[PDB]
């Protein structure tokens, strides 16, 4: 159950974050909207900057660095 | 380094002149700084003004040999109008050896330096003319 | 007090390495290596770091600098700063200031690399089911799989013991 | 609220240390045939208040230093160890629950060795340097022993969290499955606190004094958690805190009580005795406490 | 010194070198190099003169910084594509640091400043064992990691080590410094052909080890430091003289003798590539480092220096040194000329 | 590229230059060797943690214990040199000339 | 004999030798290894259903799979 | 190069079981008993394809199964299930040996009134078959073909051709 | 950074105690060295020993017992060697 | 030389400290497990030269799994672009927590 909620949440951040990118980068030349840099047609695990990117500090610090120095 | 020796050999020789002499002075300054760096590492001059003087002397002499080599290279290539011989750089190496002996102010060293630097410069241009690779194939 | 605390503790770390690479008296050198080891412990505990960074602390800041300060106390005197020491400290601070300034106000700084310049909340785990703090079970190997490694390590330390007593007048 | 937690830990340490000074003076007085200090008020609590504020009042040692910064840098390190070493100690709920705390204990003991060595170098001429050098030697020779013994007593419990220790002490005391190992550990605590029967024969004397007695209370609290005690039913921590305080007080009185009546050892007898008698015996107890949990089908639930 | 302790230290030298030979993990190679250092330190300072103490200090400092720079190269290798397999590396920078580490490990031209100083103030047994195993231990590693090295590194260190072991070498009558400069020149030779056919490198390693064992065994047969002591060995015994003749000429490498066979095969499988001027330069310098061999032979067995009595006294005692194994190594080292197709015994 | 690796490599060059240029005492050279050791330790440990290179996570502690006993041998050699001389300078070692 | 000479050494050798020997005569070591094996860290991964195999039970209540029963009974 | 194929926001709307942690931890075993039979479909999907954004229908299935199970335990006995999980909640990390008598009470409620025998140890283990409807995938590591085989050298060996074929020492 | 807050408060309060205590009133032996290196080498062997209570839950128990006894046995051989061979005598 | 007693005695005592994806003491993967398995299967029966010139694509995929260089470059470019357009002021950003 935790696994299913986790998968839906990370795909939710993927969908919303690529929507944000598609809104934000229509000035630069080139730039396909959602290319993986990789070549194989496989779901790679994202890198915590694809998930928690441009969230402005608070949630990314409480998410990445939470357990590391939480007690 | 590979970039400035490539800049020296990229010039057709040929006449595209005084860039040859500038590149040869850069070679001389680099080699003088190398040998002077070893010497100031292995002498402890005391004082440091003597160390700067020795490094300046080494860089100045090696740059002078490079400059005179490039000058008579350019002049012999323009005059003879035959850019394929090594005899012009034989003249070059002997002129560089003579001015090495001039800047150390003894003449037998200048004569032996004329002979050996002329032979090495003729061999360098001759090996560039036929084509002998740097240090390796490294294949079989 | 913010996100780039790993980067800032790394700044203090390289400052400590400069602070005893300027060649002071070796008890100041031992002080500099103790401060550097403490902030290196801070860096690796920021990566977490649950066991290994507290493990180095007993060995270097628990067993090695003790004997380095001991041998500073018993062998050399250095009984009375200098131009060369503090001048090299100034030039080391200048080089660090220049490198971190070019990290800050530009894209990337390249010795011969491409160091992608921003603070590292990336990369990290995406909240996995760790449950055993993977360092812990990793080092909780070496006794099932580790046949050869711990044998040659202990054998090397035994030979170190007989070497030390021989040079210090075996038998 | 967290800084309130820190201040409620490090405000009663001055109370504890000064009242430990009056308690050790009174208890030595009654091991001897002496009453007092009791002229300074009723039984003399204002007597530690008074001599503490007197030593603050009294004019400091004139320098006579070498690297003033280093000379201040040693006792500041000693007292900040004495403050930062009650963080993971569980009386029922510790300040910081850690993955591992006992290696932090041994590491901060080695930092106390740093304090001794730095004060010894920065102190004075060569004779005090030789004396402090022997002191650093006789301090460092026991962190082999205490870490070895602490490892062998936690090996019955497998984990380093120390709340697993306060769980696993519920049925029997840990003095019963390891009495000689605990006894040698207690002797090693007498070594680490650097008191009689072990010899040590400065500035600021009050700060070095403070580091000494906070080290003693630290080792006593860690002993009382480590080897004995009782259960802890939740939503009532006063019960375990009472039983913990009473057992730690009885053990500290026993500690000063063992101090009260024994002469100091010869130094080469001290090193000789430690190496040639505690070190093979610690190895024997370690190898038997390794090979025994694989015997008796009881390897701990290291989660 | 106890003989049990010396057997233990020899066991640990052999253990460290066999760990360097046999392992596939990088940590184990570093452990083998370090354990080789730790064991080889008390073979030196076998006496208690301060000469061996300063020599061991210099050796320990250079050896330890070489070991740690090697560890730097390995941690760079795992900063890039990371696995602990002794294979092709994954960085020109890491391979550069690693080959400079091994060049510090075994006698190379920028790094040779510790070799005559470590050999001068030590006895002969320590010098023999350090030359043999400290020139055997990195060659296995270089033989492993050859396919990812910039060639200019190896070739520059080889050329410059051959010409430094040549030119430095005309000035010393300290026989340990002579043998050390010979070691530098031959290690330049044995490193030069690493990227073309390493069978030649390992065969040259075998021949050099057997030659140096013969030479140091001849010096251990009668304790000498200078050439004048060798002239006294001429007076006291004649067969040592013809052995010095044959072994110095086989260090010289002449085609009737077996020391020529490693040069000639190098020139063959070097000139099957487009490298010709580099072989003739290397073999001119191989003509150069024969001159101190030749003046040594002139000092020992062919001209004769004036002698001192009490050699009259030493006539009444026949020789009573034990040799470890001198004659077998000698005729294995010098009459090996018609056995050139024992080249292919190696790979 | 996990930016901190640049700073720890620059710290390695700091400790390496401190190991190479050293004026008076051998103890400072040996302590900068120890600092270089700590640099390799920290750098490799952050790499293995972020890799989840969980099988062979032995490298930090075993690199540590080996180069620590190297530093022990260096301490004994420095004690021997300081025992047969007055001090432990880089000078008063100019005997045995190359 | 040496019991009067160096007694703590002899006691150390005795407890050392029994610590060496005593796992050979031991009726509990197989119990130790069964306890240590029967504790899972990772997920017990399922498999593609059947080649009509009389193993790999479908309900976790089904005792056809290998379970633990000496745990509850000491 | 290639772009990902993310699912839409139409599949990312399941009625999420926004319950807390201690009640979910205490309600685990009988949830393993009655439900958690059709989620090994999800587990086998996750371990035959390493690709969520694909197995999400079975994630919606386990989500609705857990919500249906908590609905069924919500409607009937017990309401002192609330008392049981709040007895186990404030006890630090939730040891299950803490509130044992009320565990027996909840078991007696659910047994005498509904059924659902508690899974004895160790029956939340013991590798279990599962059949699905989808056929099992092939090569989820999306790679190319194995490029070249080495021709294996075999055949009985001839002797040497005219000896060493070096300069001389023929035969 | 929570224990860094505790460390900061203890360090600042200690510096307040010291500075308010200060503004207000106004050769060698080899035997010294052998014990320290013996400490160092046995402490490193302690560092090799001490992950033993981490390790005791695996499916290879007899091998763990054997190599753990080998580590303490090697440590005991080193101890007994410097014991018998006048390493710590006076 | 490199010898092969490691293979000869049949005791594979040193092949387990070697790569990832050898069996950890609890069966957990690393971060780049499958990339390693496909790369090792790409370059197994290979003479380490067509490994250099044929398995390049999957090797670059594995390297960019291991370090994540250019993915961080893309994310950093997104961050710098986001900073300069919020410096401009167009669409005071609804990419954080709300519209």
Task: Map C68-136 to HEC letters.
Answer: HHHHHHHCCCCCCCCHHHHHHHHHHHHHHHHHHHHHHCCCEECCCCCEECCCCCCCCCCCCCCCCCCHH
D25 vs D47: CA distance, rounded Å: 11
Question: How many residues does this entry show for chain B?
Answer: 140
CB C170 within 8 A of CB E2: yes
Q: Vertex E48, ends E44 and E51: CA angle to 5°?
A: 70
Contacts 24+ apart (CB under 8 A), C13-16: C13/C39, C13/C40, C13/C43, C13/F7, C13/F8, C13/F11, C14/C96, C14/F7, C14/F10, C14/F11, C14/F14, C15/C93, C15/C96
Query: Which two tokens mark A33?
Result: 């909207």
Give I-chain residues touching A71 at CB under 8 angstroms: 2
Pairing relationship of beta strands C115-116 and G47-48 according to DSSP bridges: unpaired
Contacts of C16 (CB under 8 A, 6+ apart): C32, C33, C35, C36, C39
H67 vs H64: CA distance, rounded Å: 5
Give H-chain residues touching D163 at CB under 8 angstroms: 92
CA D142 to chain centre: 13
Residue F73: which domain range? Answer: 1-86
Interface D-G, measured as beta-carbon pairs within 8 A, has a size of 39
Q: Which chain E residues in 328-347 lie under 8 Å from chain H, judged by CB atoms?
A: 338, 340-341, 344
E129 vs E46: CA distance, rounded Å: 13
Say yes or no: D234 contacts chain H, CB-CB below 8 A.
Answer: yes
E327 vs C94: CA distance, rounded Å: 65
DSSP A35: B
Query: Which two tokens mark D114?
Result: 């740093």
Distance between A70 CA and the closest CA of chain J, angstroms: 23
Peptide bond into E307 cis (omega under 30): no
- The β-bridge partners of H129 are G47
DSSP E24: -
Give C-chain residues touching D116 at CB under 8 angstroms: none
F48 vs E339: CA distance, rounded Å: 52
Query: Which two tokens mark D228?
Result: 């004995």
D128 vs D137: CA distance, rounded Å: 14
Task: Please count the structural domains in chain E.
Answer: 1
H147 vs I30: CA distance, rounded Å: 66
Say yes or no: G2 contacts chain H, CB-CB below 8 A.
Answer: no
Query: Which two tokens mark F43?
Result: 């750098």
Identify the burial level of E74 via C-beta atoms within 10 angstroms of its C-beta, where 0-12 means exposed, 13-18 middle and 19 or more buried: buried
SS3 content of chain D, % helix, strand, coil (to 5): 65, 0, 35
D117 vs D136: CA distance, rounded Å: 6
Query: Which two tokens mark E211?
Result: 């030659």
G56 vs G46: CA distance, rounded Å: 9
Say yes or no: D300 contacts chain I, CB-CB below 8 A.
Answer: yes
CB D170 within 8 A of CB D231: yes
Query: Which two tokens mark D53?
Result: 């504020």
E164 vs E189: CA distance, rounded Å: 12
CB A53 within 8 A of CB H47: no
- Measuring CA to CA, which residue among H46, H123, H43 is closest to residue G46? H43
Q: Which residue has the tokens 């011989």?
A: B85
Q: Which residue from C minimizes the CA distance to F57?
A: C138
Q: Which residue from J minimizes the CA distance to A54?
A: J79
DSSP H3: B
- Radius of gyration, alpha carbons of chain F: 17
Q: Which chain C residues in 40-79 lie under 8 Å from chain F, judged by CB atoms?
A: 40, 43-44, 47-49, 52-53, 55-56, 59-60, 63-65, 67-68, 71-72, 74-78
- The β-bridge partners of C108 are C116
E347 vs B86: CA distance, rounded Å: 45
D287 vs D281: CA distance, rounded Å: 10
F64 vs F41: CA distance, rounded Å: 7
CA H161 to chain centre: 64
Q: Which chain H residues in 54-73 lie under 8 Å from chain J, judged by CB atoms?
A: none
Dihedrals φ, ψ of F4, to 5°? -60, -25
Q: Which residues of G52-62 are buried (b: 16+ CB within 10 A; e: fewer)?
A: eeeebbbebee
Query: Which two tokens mark H10?
Result: 């139409």
Q: Resolution to 1 decimal, in Å?
A: 5.7
G11 vs G19: CA distance, rounded Å: 12
Give G-chain residues touching J27 at CB under 8 angstroms: 41-42
Q: Which residues of I66-85 are buried (b: 16+ CB within 10 A; e: fewer)?
A: ebbbebbbbbbebbeebbeb
CB contact under 8 A, G22 and D287: no
| Chain J: residues touching E (Cβ < 8 Å) | 1-3, 5-6, 14-15, 17-20, 48, 52, 59, 62-63, 66-67
Give E-chain residues touching B140 at CB under 8 angstroms: 196-197, 272-273
CB contact under 8 A, F58 and C138: yes
B15 vs B77: CA distance, rounded Å: 7
HSE-up (13 A, CA, CB side) for residue D238: 1
Query: Which two tokens mark E5?
Result: 């302790």
E242 vs B108: CA distance, rounded Å: 43
Give H-chain residues touching E260 at CB under 8 angstroms: none
Could you tell me the CATH number of the domain that includes residue F60? 1.10.287.3510
CB contact under 8 A, F75 and I37: yes
Q: Which residues of E116-145 are buried (b: 16+ CB within 10 A; e: fewer)?
A: bbbbbbbbbebbbbbbbbbbbbbbbbbbbb
Distance between D297 CA and the closest CA of chain G, angstroms: 5
D135 vs C71: CA distance, rounded Å: 15
F65 vs C150: CA distance, rounded Å: 11
Give E-chain residues touching J3 at CB under 8 angstroms: 21-22
Residue C118 neighbours by CB distance under 10 Å: 21
Query: Which two tokens mark I37?
Result: 């290196």
Residue F25, classed as helix, strand or coil, is strand
Peptide bond into E50 cis (omega under 30): no
Residue E197, classed as helix, strand or coil, is coil
Peptide bond into C123 cis (omega under 30): yes
Who among J3, J52, J66 is closest to E21 (CB)?
J3
CB C50 within 8 A of CB C133: yes
CB E109 within 8 A of CB E186: no
HSE-up (13 A, CA, CB side) for residue D298: 10
CB H61 within 8 A of CB H41: yes
CB contact under 8 A, J42 and H147: yes
I41 vs H1: CA distance, rounded Å: 55
D214 vs D195: CA distance, rounded Å: 13
Distance between D257 CA and the closest CA of chain I, angstroms: 31
DSSP C145: S
Identify the burial level of D42 via C-beta atoms within 10 angstroms of its C-beta, where 0-12 means exposed, 13-18 middle and 19 or more buried: exposed
H156 vs E61: CA distance, rounded Å: 56
E42 vs E56: CA distance, rounded Å: 9
Contacts of I17 (CB under 8 A, 6+ apart): D79, D207
- Radius of gyration, alpha carbons of chain J: 22
Alpha helices in chain E (DSSP H): 3-22, 26-40, 50-79, 92-106, 115-120, 124-145, 151-167, 175-192, 198-220, 227-236, 239-252, 261-271, 277-288, 291-297, 311-314, 327-334
Looking only at Cα atoms, what is the longest distance across chain H?
Answer: 101
- The per-residue DSSP string of B53-111 comes to HHHHHHHHHHHHHHHHHHHHHHHHHHHH--TT-SHHHHHHHHHHHHHHHHHHT-HHHHH
CB C46 within 8 A of CB A69: yes
Residue G3, classed as helix, strand or coil, is coil
E134 vs E115: CA distance, rounded Å: 11
Residue F75 covered by a domain: yes
Residue A71, classed as helix, strand or coil, is coil
SS3 content of chain B, % helix, strand, coil (to 5): 75, 0, 25
C59 vs C54: CA distance, rounded Å: 9
Query: Which two tokens mark E109?
Result: 């031209």
CB contact under 8 A, C141 and I55: yes
Who among A45, A61, A67 is closest to C3 (CB)?
A61
Q: Which residue has the tokens 């067995």?
A: E301
Residue F73 covered by a domain: yes
The beta strands (E) that lie in I1-90 are given as: none
Dihedrals φ, ψ of D96, to 5°? -130, 115
Say yes or no: G29 contacts chain I, CB-CB below 8 A.
Answer: yes
Fold for I1-85, please state it.
Answer: Methane Monooxygenase Hydroxylase; Chain G, domain 1 (1.20.58)
Q: Which residue has the tokens 């079970």?
A: C137
Give F-chain residues touching J18 at CB under 8 angstroms: 56
- The per-residue DSSP string of D196-254 comes to TTS------HHHHHHHHHHHHHHHHHHHHHHH------SS-HHHHHHHHHHHHHHHHHH
- The β-bridge partners of H130 are G48
3-state secondary structure D41-109: CCCCCHHHHHHHHHHHHCCCCCCCCCCHHHHHHHHHHHHHHHHCCCCCCCCCCCCCCCCCCHHHHHHHH
Task: Please count the structural domains in chain F.
Answer: 1
Question: How many residues does this entry show for chain J?
Answer: 99
E278 vs J11: CA distance, rounded Å: 46
Dihedrals φ, ψ of D200, to 5°? -135, 15
Residue from F34, F37, F47, F82 whose CB has the most chain C CBs within 10 Å, to mutate: F34
- Measuring CA to CA, which residue among E42, I70, C58 is closest to residue F65? C58
Dihedral sign of CA atoms H76, H77, H83, H84 in order: negative
- The β-bridge partners of H3 are A35
F59 vs F46: CA distance, rounded Å: 11
Pairing relationship of beta strands G47-48 and H129-130 according to DSSP bridges: parallel
D224 vs D254: CA distance, rounded Å: 13
DSSP I26: -
Q: Which residue has the tokens 């299935």?
A: H61
CB D154 within 8 A of CB D165: yes
CA D70 to chain centre: 25
CA E50 to chain centre: 25
C51 vs D107: CA distance, rounded Å: 13
Chains J and G: 3 or more CB pairs within 8 Å of each other: yes
- Measuring CA to CA, which residue among D18, D130, D123 is closest to residue D68? D123
- Radius of gyration, alpha carbons of chain G: 23
C54 vs C42: CA distance, rounded Å: 9
Experimentally determined by: cryo-EM
E44 vs E60: CA distance, rounded Å: 11
- The β-bridge partners of E280 are none
Fold for C2-168, please state it.
Answer: 1.20.120
Residue E225: which domain range? Answer: 1-347
């Amino acid at each position: 159950l935790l696994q299913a909620e986790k998968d839906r949440r990370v795909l939710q951040m993927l969908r919303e974050n690529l929507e944000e990118e598609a809104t934000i980068m229509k000035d630069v030349p080139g730039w396909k909207v959602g290319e993986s840099v990789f070549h194989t047609t496989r779901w790679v695990t994202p890198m915590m900057g694809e998930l928690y990117g441009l969230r402005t500090g608070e949630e990314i610090l409480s998410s990445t660095y939470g357990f590391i120095w939480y007690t | 380094a590979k970039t400035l020796l490539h800049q020296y050999w990229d010039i057709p020789e040929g006449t595209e002149c005084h860039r040859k002499t500038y590149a040869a002075t850069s070679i001389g300054g680099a080699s003088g700084l190398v040998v002077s760096a070893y010497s100031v590492a292995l002498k402890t001059p005391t004082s440091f003004l003597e160390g700067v003087a020795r490094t300046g002397r080494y860089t100045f002499t090696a740059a002078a040999i490079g400059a005179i080599f490039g000058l008579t290279s350019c002049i012999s290539a323009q005059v003879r109008e035959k850019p394929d011989d090594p005899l012009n750089y034989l003249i070059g190496g002997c002129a560089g050896g003579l001015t090495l002996g001039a800047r150390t102010r003894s003449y037998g060293i200048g004569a032996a330096a004329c002979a050996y630097m002329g032979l090495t410069a003729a061999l360098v241009k001759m090996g560039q003319l036929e084509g002998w690779k740097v240090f390796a194939e490294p294949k079989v | 007090m913010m996100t780039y605390i790993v980067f800032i503790l790394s700044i203090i770390f390289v400052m400590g390495f400069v602070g005893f690479s300027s060649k002071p008296s070796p008890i100041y050198g031992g002080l500099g290596l103790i401060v550097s080891g403490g902030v290196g412990c801070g860096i690796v505990l920021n990566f977490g770091g649950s066991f290994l960074g507290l493990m180095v602390f007993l060995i270097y800041l628990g067993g090695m600098m003790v004997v380095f300060g001991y041998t500073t106390a018993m062998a050399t005197e250095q009984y009375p700063s200098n131009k060369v020491v503090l001048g090299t400290f100034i030039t080391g601070l200048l080089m660090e200031f220049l490198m971190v300034y070019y990290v800050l106000k530009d894209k990337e700084v390249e010795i011969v690399f491409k160091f992608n310049g921003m603070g590292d909340w990336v990369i990290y785990d995406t909240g996995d089911s760790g449950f055993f703090s993977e360092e812990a079970m990793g080092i909780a190997a070496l006794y099932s799989y580790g046949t050869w490694l711990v044998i040659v390590t202990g054998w090397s330390l035994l030979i170190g013991v007989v070497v030390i007593m021989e040079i210090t007048r075996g038998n | 609220m967290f800084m309130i937690n820190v201040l409620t830990l490090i405000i009663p340490i001055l109370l504890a240390v000064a009242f430990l000074t009056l308690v050790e003076r009174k208890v030595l007085g009654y091991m001897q045939f002496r009453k007092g200090p009791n002229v300074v008020g009723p039984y003399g609590l204002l007597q530690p208040i008074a001599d503490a504020i007197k030593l603050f009042i009294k004019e400091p040692l004139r320098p006579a230093t070498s690297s003033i910064s280093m000379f201040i840098l040693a006792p500041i390190l000693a007292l900040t160890l004495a403050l930062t070493m009650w963080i993971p100690l569980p009386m029922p709920y510790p300040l910081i629950n850690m993955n591992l705390g006992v290696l932090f204990m041994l590491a901060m003991s080695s930092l106390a060795v740093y304090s001794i060595l730095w004060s010894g170098w920065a102190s004075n001429s060569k004779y005090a340097l030789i004396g402090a050098l022997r002191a650093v030697a006789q301090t460092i020779s026991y962190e082999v022993t205490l870490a070895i013994i602490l490892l062998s007593v936690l090996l019955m419990n497998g984990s380093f969290t120390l709340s697993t220790l306060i769980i696993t002490q519920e049925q029997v005391w840990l003095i019963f499955p390891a009495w000689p190992l605990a006894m040698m550990w207690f002797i090693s605590t007498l070594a680490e606190t650097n008191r009689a029967p072990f010899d040590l024969t400065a500035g600021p004397f009050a700060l070095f004094f403070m580091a000494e007695y906070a080290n003693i209370i630290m080792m006593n609290i860690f002993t009382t958690t480590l080897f004995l005690g009782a259960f802890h039913n939740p939503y009532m921590p006063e019960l375990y805190t009472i039983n913990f305080t009473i057992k730690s007080l009885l053990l500290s009185i026993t500690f000063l009580w063992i101090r009260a009546s024994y002469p100091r050892f010869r130094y080469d007898q001290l090193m000789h005795l430690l190496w040639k008698n505690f070190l093979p015996l610690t190895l024997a107890l370690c190898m038997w406490h390794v090979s025994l949990p694989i015997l008796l089908s009881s390897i701990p639930p290291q989660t | 010194m106890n003989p049990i302790i010396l057997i233990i230290i020899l066991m640990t030298v052999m253990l460290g070198t066999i760990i360097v030979m046999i392992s596939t993990h990088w940590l184990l190679i570093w452990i083998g190099f370090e354990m080789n250092m730790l064991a080889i330190i008390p073979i030196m300072m076998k006496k208690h003169n301060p000469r061996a103490t300063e020599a061991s200090t210099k050796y320990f400092l250079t050896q330890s910084t070489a070991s740690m720079l090697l560890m730097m190269a390995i941690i760079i290798n795992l900063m890039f594509s990371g696995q602990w397999t002794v294979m092709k590396l994954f960085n020109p920078m890491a391979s550069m640091l690693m080959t400079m580490a091994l060049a510090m490990k075994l006698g190379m031209a920028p790094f040779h400043f510790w070799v005559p100083e470590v050999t001068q103030g030590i006895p002969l047994s320590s010098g023999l064992i350090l030359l043999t195993w400290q020139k055997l231990a990195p060659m296995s590693v270089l033989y492993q990691i050859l396919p990812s090295i910039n060639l200019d590194l190896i070739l520059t260190l080889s050329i410059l080590s051959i010409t430094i072991g040549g030119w430095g070498g005309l000035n010393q009558t300290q026989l340990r410094k002579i043998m050390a400069y010979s070691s530098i020149a031959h290690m330049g030779w044995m490193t030069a052909v690493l990227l073309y056919n390493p069978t030649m490198t390992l065969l040259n390693l075998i021949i050099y080890i057997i030659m140096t064992s013969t030479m140091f065994t001849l010096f251990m047969a009668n304790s000498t430091t200078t050439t004048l002591s060798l002239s006294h060995t001429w007076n006291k015994a004649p067969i040592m003289t013809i052995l010095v003749l044959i072994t110095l000429l086989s260090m010289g490498g002449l085609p009737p003798l077996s020391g020529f066979m490693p040069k000639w095969m190098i020139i063959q499988e070097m000139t099957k590539n487009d490298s010709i001027i580099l072989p003739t330069l290397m073999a001119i310098t191989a003509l150069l480092n024969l001159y101190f061999y030749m003046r040594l032979t002139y000092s020992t067995a062919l001209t004769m220096f004036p002698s001192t009595n009490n050699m009259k006294m030493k006539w009444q005692f026949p020789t009573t040194k034990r040799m470890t194994l001198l004659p077998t190594m000698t005729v294995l080292s010098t009459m090996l000329l018609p056995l050139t197709p024992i080249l292919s015994i190696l790979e | 590229m996990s930016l901190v690796y640049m700073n720890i490599m620059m710290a390695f060059t700091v400790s390496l230059t401190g190991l190479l240029m050293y004026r008076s005492h051998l103890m400072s050279s040996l302590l900068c060797l120890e600092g270089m050791m700590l640099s390799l330790f920290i750098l490799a440990t952050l790499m293995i943690l972020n890799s989840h290179f969980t099988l062979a996570s032995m490298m930090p502690i075993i690199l540590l214990v080996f180069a620590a006993c190297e530093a022990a041998l260096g301490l004994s050699l420095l004690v021997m040199v300081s025992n047969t001389y007055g001090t432990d300078y880089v000078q008063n070692l100019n005997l045995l000339q190359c | 004999n040496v019991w009067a000479k160096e007694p703590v050494l002899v006691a150390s050798f005795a407890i050392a030798g029994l610590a060496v020997i005593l796992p050979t005569l031991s009726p509990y070591t197989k119990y130790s290894l069964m306890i240590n094996r029967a504790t899972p860290y990772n997920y017990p991964v399922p498999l593609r259903d059947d080649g009509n195999m009389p193993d790999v039970p479908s309900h976790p209540q089904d005792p056809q799979g290998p379970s633990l029963e000496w745990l509850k009974r000491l | 190069p290639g772009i990902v194929e993310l699912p839409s926001l139409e599949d990312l709307k399941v009625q999420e079981v926004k319950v807390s942690s201690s009640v979910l931890k205490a309600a685990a075993h009988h949830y393993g008993a009655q439900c958690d039979k059709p989620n090994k479909e999800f587990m086998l999907c996750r371990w035959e394809e390493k690709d969520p954004r694909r197995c999400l229908e079975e994630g919606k299935l386990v989500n609705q199964c857990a919500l249906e199970f908590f609905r069924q335990i919500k409607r009937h006995c017990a309401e002192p299930f609330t008392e049981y999980w709040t007895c186990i909640d404030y006890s630090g990390l939730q040891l299950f040996r803490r509130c044992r008598k009320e565990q027996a009470q909840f078991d007696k409620c659910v047994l005498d009134k509904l059924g659902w025998v508690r899974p004895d140890l160790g029956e939340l283990s013991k590798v279990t078959k599962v059949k699905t409807d989808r056929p099992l995938p092939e090569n989820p590591y999306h790679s190319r073909a194995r490029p070249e085989p080495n021709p294996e050298v075999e055949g009985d060996l001839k002797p040497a051709r005219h000896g060493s074929r070096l300069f001389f020492w023929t035969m | 950074m929570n224990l860094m807050i505790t460390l900061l408060t203890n360090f600042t309060l200690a510096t307040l105690l010291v500075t308010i205590a200060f503004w207000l009133p106004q050769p060698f032996s080899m035997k010294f060295f052998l014990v320290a290196i013996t400490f160092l080498l046995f402490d490193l062997e302690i560092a090799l020993l001490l992950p033993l209570p981490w390790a005791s839950q695996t499916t290879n128990l007899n091998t763990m017992l054997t190599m753990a006894l080998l580590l303490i046995f090697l440590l005991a051989v080193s101890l007994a060697y410097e014991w018998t061979q006048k390493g710590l005598e006076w | 030389p490199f010898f092969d007693v490691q293979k000869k005695l049949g005791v594979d005592l040193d092949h387990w400290m070697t790569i990832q994806s050898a069996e950890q003491p609890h069966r957990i993967p690393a971060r780049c497990h499958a990339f390693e398995k496909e790369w090792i299967e790409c370059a197994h029966g290979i003479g380490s030269i067509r490994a250099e010139k044929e398995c390049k694509i999957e090797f670059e995929d594995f390297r960019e799994c291991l370090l994540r260089q250019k993915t961080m470059k893309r994310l950093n470019a997104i961050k710098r672009q986001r900073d300069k357009l919020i410096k401009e002021g167009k669409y005071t950003p609804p990419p954080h927590h709300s519209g």
